Amino acid sequence: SLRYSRHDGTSCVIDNHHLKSLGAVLNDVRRKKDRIREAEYEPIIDIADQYMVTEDPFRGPGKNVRITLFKEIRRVHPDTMKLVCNWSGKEFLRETWTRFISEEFPITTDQEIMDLWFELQLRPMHPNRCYKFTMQYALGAHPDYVAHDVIRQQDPYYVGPNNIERINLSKKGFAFPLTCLQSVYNDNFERFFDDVLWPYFYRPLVYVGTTSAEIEEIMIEVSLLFKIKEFAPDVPLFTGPAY
Amino acid sequence: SLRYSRHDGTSCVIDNHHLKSLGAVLNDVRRKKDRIREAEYEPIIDIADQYMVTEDPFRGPGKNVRITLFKEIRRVHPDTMKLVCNWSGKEFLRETWTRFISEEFPITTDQEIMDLWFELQLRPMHPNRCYKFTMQYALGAHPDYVAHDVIRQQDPYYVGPNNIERINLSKKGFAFPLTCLQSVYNDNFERFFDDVLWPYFYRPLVYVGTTSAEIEEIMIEVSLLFKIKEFAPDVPLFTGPAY
Amino acid sequence: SLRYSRHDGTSCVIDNHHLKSLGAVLNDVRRKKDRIREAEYEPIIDIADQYMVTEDPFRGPGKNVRITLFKEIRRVHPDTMKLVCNWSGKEFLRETWTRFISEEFPITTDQEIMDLWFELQLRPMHPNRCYKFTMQYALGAHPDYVAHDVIRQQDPYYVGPNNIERINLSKKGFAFPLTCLQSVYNDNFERFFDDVLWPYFYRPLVYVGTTSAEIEEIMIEVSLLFKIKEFAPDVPLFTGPAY
Amino acid sequence: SLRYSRHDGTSCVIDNHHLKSLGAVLNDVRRKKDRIREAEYEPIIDIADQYMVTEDPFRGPGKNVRITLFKEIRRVHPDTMKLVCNWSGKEFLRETWTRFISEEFPITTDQEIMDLWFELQLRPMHPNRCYKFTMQYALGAHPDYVAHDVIRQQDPYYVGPNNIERINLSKKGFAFPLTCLQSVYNDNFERFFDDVLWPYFYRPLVYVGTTSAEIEEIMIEVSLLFKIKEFAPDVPLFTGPAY
Amino acid sequence: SLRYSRHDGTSCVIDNHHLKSLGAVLNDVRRKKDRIREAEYEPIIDIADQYMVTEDPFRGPGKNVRITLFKEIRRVHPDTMKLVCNWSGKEFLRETWTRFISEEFPITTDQEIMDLWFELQLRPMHPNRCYKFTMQYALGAHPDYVAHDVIRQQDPYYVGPNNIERINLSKKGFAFPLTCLQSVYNDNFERFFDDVLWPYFYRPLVYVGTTSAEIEEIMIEVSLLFKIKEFAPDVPLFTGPAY
Amino acid sequence: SLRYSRHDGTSCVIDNHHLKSLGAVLNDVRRKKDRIREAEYEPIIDIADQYMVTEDPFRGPGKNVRITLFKEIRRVHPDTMKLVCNWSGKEFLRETWTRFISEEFPITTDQEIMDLWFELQLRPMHPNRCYKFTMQYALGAHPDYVAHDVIRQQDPYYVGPNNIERINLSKKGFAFPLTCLQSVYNDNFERFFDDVLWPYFYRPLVYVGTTSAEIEEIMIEVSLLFKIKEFAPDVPLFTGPAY
Amino acid sequence: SLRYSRHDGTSCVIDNHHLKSLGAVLNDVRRKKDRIREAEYEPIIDIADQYMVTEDPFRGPGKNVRITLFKEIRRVHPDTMKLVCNWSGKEFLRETWTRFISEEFPITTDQEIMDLWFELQLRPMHPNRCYKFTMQYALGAHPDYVAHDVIRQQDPYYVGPNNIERINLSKKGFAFPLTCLQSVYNDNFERFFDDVLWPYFYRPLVYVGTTSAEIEEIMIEVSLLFKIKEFAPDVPLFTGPAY
Amino acid sequence: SLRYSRHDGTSCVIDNHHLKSLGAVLNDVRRKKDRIREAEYEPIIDIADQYMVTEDPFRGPGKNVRITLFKEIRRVHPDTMKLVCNWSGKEFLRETWTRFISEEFPITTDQEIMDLWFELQLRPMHPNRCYKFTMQYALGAHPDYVAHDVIRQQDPYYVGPNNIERINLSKKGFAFPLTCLQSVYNDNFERFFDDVLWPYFYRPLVYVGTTSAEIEEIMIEVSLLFKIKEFAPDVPLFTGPAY
């Protein structure tokens, strides 16, 4: 933050003649030099504007609601990964519906869930170590298929710089307690579960490993991150009766 | 554009001895210096080629057909947004089908609609103002759910530099008058409407606001932008009878 | 002039996710880098804003009226200067009043003469010469003092780059046909002359030389440059009778 | 100073073919590169040519005549200033007229005093000190008003880098022994004094201090600096009788 | 091209004091900085002025007269070259004398042929190819020696950037229709041929190839380029009788 | 050598949308920046293309045949030079003809000797010395003029960086065993010698010295370097009878 | 010139441990950095070593003997050139032989004239002019052909930076008083003239002009510049009898 | 390493004229530019040559003999250090004398031990850790003073980058098996021990720790490093009898 907001200097008049601050005039000269530079490179920006980048979903539009679920410790051998969660489809839907509804109610505004994200957050439990985290996942399997508790690493997802991976769970597969833009109605888990077509097939199965050449002890925080658009009218709240 | 196409200079022969332009030889020396620079940074480009960017859909493959729909003026209070359109699902499909078919017919070539985009284009109606535009949208709701005409802003989409937002309307939800790669058949709105499964559920509901601390008057142009691949054969058009 | 007015690129939305042009995002990054640079040097501009520069009176406020008077050729020896004009006070006031009034009438607006300038404009009369111009002047002397037609140079005024010197003639000494902010009245040279206190004392006596080591032939255009503020009301001109 | 005056190299002809020095050709190439740079920045110079700076009166037109008056030592406490001179108006005019006339006579040429400057020149009298000089002045007061010999500092004039302040004494207030462009006549102090309207009102009263946090011993040289334009004709001096 | 010819800014005089444009003063400062740079590198230019370069004969002194002779197409295998011309000495002299004399007559001025050049000009006949041209030549052989129509490439002349090779044909070997500085006399091919000592020995035999790894189709324009100095007097042409 | 041949990155298509490697897109942006730089300096290259440089005859067209002649040791005093060879014209022609013919025969291809060069190659015979070599030569003199075996240095030729001087021996003066483009005939030294007009006048007389301030011991290799163009047809060699 | 010859610093030994000057160690580090730079650019120098430049004949091998001939003044109209000399072949040979022999005798050493140059040296005769010089020449013509005293300019030779053109006069055409490497014999102009085959055909005819748009007065110094190799033995001169 | 040893390019002579490689001439120009830079900074090197740095004793004069003694593992708590060795003075002298003599014998040359160093070399025993090593030492104490096996860290020596600390053991305190420059005599530990004045007082007591916030397992190699000057004559070794 600068102190003058580019309003540096002033002006005055002596004998019809106009004086202006030297620093301000030098800025005018330097801004003309820069302006010429902008036009010189504008053709180069047009070549770059042939392509686009994507806005961070968590720093971007919509609000973040982090429904934390549980914590867990794992010790992982080198070149392996351990399973983080092994819920069935039903148990996953119970935690999803139950934790979101009981945290957010009363839901007083029309809104829509933009995206549902599975958040895997990792931190070391010893100091003076240097390694990075790795991840692998699946999202569906035979209800009587029980996943390996440990696997060897092969072409995993390298966890990002802040030690957080967020995995999108698309509305096609994973059911949301709020489907579209809607007001809430009277609802319960039983009618929610009954309206899910394949309740036992879809569940997140996530593994975690490291790039370390020794065993490492990992602390894990798992959460569901909801992106939500609210449509709150521009009206007052009154105590009844209104007016 | 340069005048010589890097064919600067020439050569000649005097007494078996070869002469070449000094400027051209200096370019050869500088190109060798640059070529060495390319190889020095090639390992750095490999680190950048681990990731990819996306090509502008409107400057990229396919042609653009802008079916403009209507214009509208709105005055928006600070920290609020006003609804742009409130059509039902049926009225949206009538405008979509009717305006595209009557603008494009006769459709003389096999083709496919790649993408359907809702275009929101905004321009100020007073000069000497400095603010940016914001946007929020929904795409589905109860047919008897009527949207708020004005809402307070919360985590909106910031409109891009040229004051244009284009919102993709995926084939899953919004019905296209041309589904796949096909030739046109005899068609009408009634049979089109009858084959849409959920005609009354999906409609774009878009809001617009500003980053200004005062009321601002906005002019709005709404359009449907179609991306289209044509498959025109490499054959002549003759007056009948051919040959 | 640049083609996009810093509105480079655009934005669009695919599956709730926001895309923006790569060139525009890189400009945002570079503008942040520059903005940090501005704040780093703002303390330096404050040291420069302790002092001020003066605006060019001829490119600055007020309009320019160039009442050209006469032309003249002179041949000047090295290290000398020749007199340009030798009018008495009365003859100078006749040219001043007569030429300005007959050029500007009808004077239809309230106005004030800000400054009166004596303009000496010089151009070579042979090609392929390289030298600069020099100048010296006086403004008053005994009416029976007749000035030397030629003098040796000593510490002269070096004429500026465009070969124009403009010498201010302050209202204290030299009388203006329009003293202050006023509408014109019925006027003539005789009543103007009668109201000048010292009509025979003040007259510009200007010399011109060169930095050349040989005789040079100079063409001279002399003019009076008036700086004028007009106070024209924001009202229409009608043909009488009005309304 | 360079040794070749940009006439570096030479040329010769062998078998109709023209050879030229390599160093000279490289200068031609570099001068073209610079010339392109000049044109690229010419628009920036136009923004700077909206304003003007003022030429040093003492390095610029006119000659300098330094009529030194007296020397003085003062010891000044921190945050104070001591009076340098306390002459009445008459005593100041006696020194001004007497010292200039007796130093310059015989005045053999027509001339005019452009400006009269009061010069205050300061030097330390101990080594290994680090401080700057400050100044304050007045120019008129009741003849029976006697100035304070010492004052506290408040918003003083900071003396320039070379430890010299020169204060203009305008012809309106302070009388010159040579009013305009004139030849000298028989003159004396009594008729000069009689023609000064307010001889006892105008006199320079100048104070001097420092930026030091300890007492400092200052040596002072006071002078009157005259700027003078001479109008010496381009004619010989002969022993009489001429020709 | 710049707009002010380094006459940027101006000057004026207010109360004896000289003002000059800020942009012009900054140029004076920057020119002093550059001038110091010139002197710093002048010793380096002296080391480069130990050697010389040669002026382009075709951009340099003398005028160019391009007597085009014929055009030709060739298909050249990789690593080979095809003969361009196979004239005998007599046939070459007939084309040389005949084409120059009939193109240039009437030759109305005293002049001398500085140099005679064989011009080989090459252009591709397919687009979207990338290769360069090569050349080899001989100038004399037994009159009954008939040259190979195709040869393998070995250490050829690499054609210059603009696809033009010009081969000097020295006056010792190849006869000129105008030997020295002369006016034309009545002349014909028979007396020209009779005065050539070895008319059948000297003829240009030129080959052309490529750097391509495939057959390429080449279009060829062959010409004789004369360099000519004219000595036209500074006199008028009149209709007879003169005066 | 770089690993990708500027084919860095790739592309793919997801949901009609085109993705391209980030590193490749950044190269496109940087190449546009460079391309703009090329056009900015193209006017400067045109000033340099007014002149030309000469191609190294030994790295350039034609093949090199180094007919080494003899070796020699000399001790040279400071500021002096010793004669390298003192052959008469006849003895020089015997070595020239004899050594070239017996080394090159059988000469199976039509060819022409472009240039004949006298090669003087020098190397120190003590380590840990620092000096350069110098050279002087003559090419003709009275047959009974015997050259000084040692001379003082005055304005000599400074030998090049690699300690090799090559002196052209023009066909005018020094006779070649192969005059023009020709096939070989039955030949011998006696008929070769008989056809040389001035066999005893032309012989290379070369001196060698140093820039050292002490005696230095020099090893010398002398050779004749022939530049040769071959005209080998594009035909097979068969064992007879052919076909 | 530097003061230490890169022998900066020293060394000493304290308790077996070696100390060395910090400045010297930093030079060792910087020299390693530079040495790495040399190797990085060595591949670029190899591309430049494909071509060669030519050493200034007058700053290079051989000594210069400037036999000045005459001086001359000319006034030249714009776009014209005036003849400098109009001697016949015989008169040119008389000046050449006579002036060289009488200036150089006694010629006490074996020597050879490397080159003969016609030197045209030009200087302005007015100050404060800015123009360059131009040149054109011929070398042979009919003895009864008398050249135009003035011609219009067309594609002239632009004189070099130092206002000197030197035109080579090859031994083929122009006869030298010393043909080869030789001792002098008894000689005279008559036997010299008798042995010149074409004494009346070859003579330098040189014109001079300017790039000025006005008449200019030129001073001309003409000279013959001889390049000479001496072969002075390393022997003493004694007074006779020797030893 | 570069390929040409700064002998880039060559030279040749054509028609008395000297040609030299362009790349070599450009190096000459750049070397002159650098040489000017050296002289510009030579005054700055003189300011740095007021001070000196010390040569690495182990990369510098003398040879290194590393008498390794033992290896050891320690586990060290954070902010603590463990004792590495606890020998008495006698046991230290036994290892010193015994290990050096039995490793080096036969000692066939006159020599002197310059310095004796205690080498502490440290390496981690787990991967993927990030910490540095610390050290503290004493050299003498009461023979019946037994040192603490572990201490808390306070202002320790930070081990160097390569994880090696070498501690000088001065000849005053610690006895050497070879005192000065000497040949070996018949010697044994008992007479060596008897001639040490204070055999039980001086012994190295060294501690080791880390900068880690967790326990770390360290592997330790301890050695005595001898610096030795040999004085081997320049004479042959023969089998007896010699000659």
From Swiss-Prot, chains A, B, C, D, E, F, G, H:
<protein>
    <recommendedName>
        <fullName>Granulin</fullName>
    </recommendedName>
</protein>
<dbReference type="InterPro" id="IPR001746">
    <property type="entry name" value="Polyhedrin"/>
</dbReference>
<dbReference type="Pfam" id="PF00738">
    <property type="entry name" value="Polyhedrin"/>
</dbReference>
<comment type="similarity">
    <text>Belongs to the polyhedrin family.</text>
</comment>
<dbReference type="GO" id="GO:0005198">
    <property type="term" value="F:structural molecule activity"/>
</dbReference>
<dbReference type="GO" id="GO:0039679">
    <property type="term" value="C:viral occlusion body"/>
</dbReference>
<keyword id="KW-0842">Viral occlusion body</keyword>
<comment type="function">
    <text>Component of the virus occlusion bodies, which are large proteinaceous structures, that protect the virus from the outside environment for extended periods until they are ingested by insect larvae.</text>
</comment>
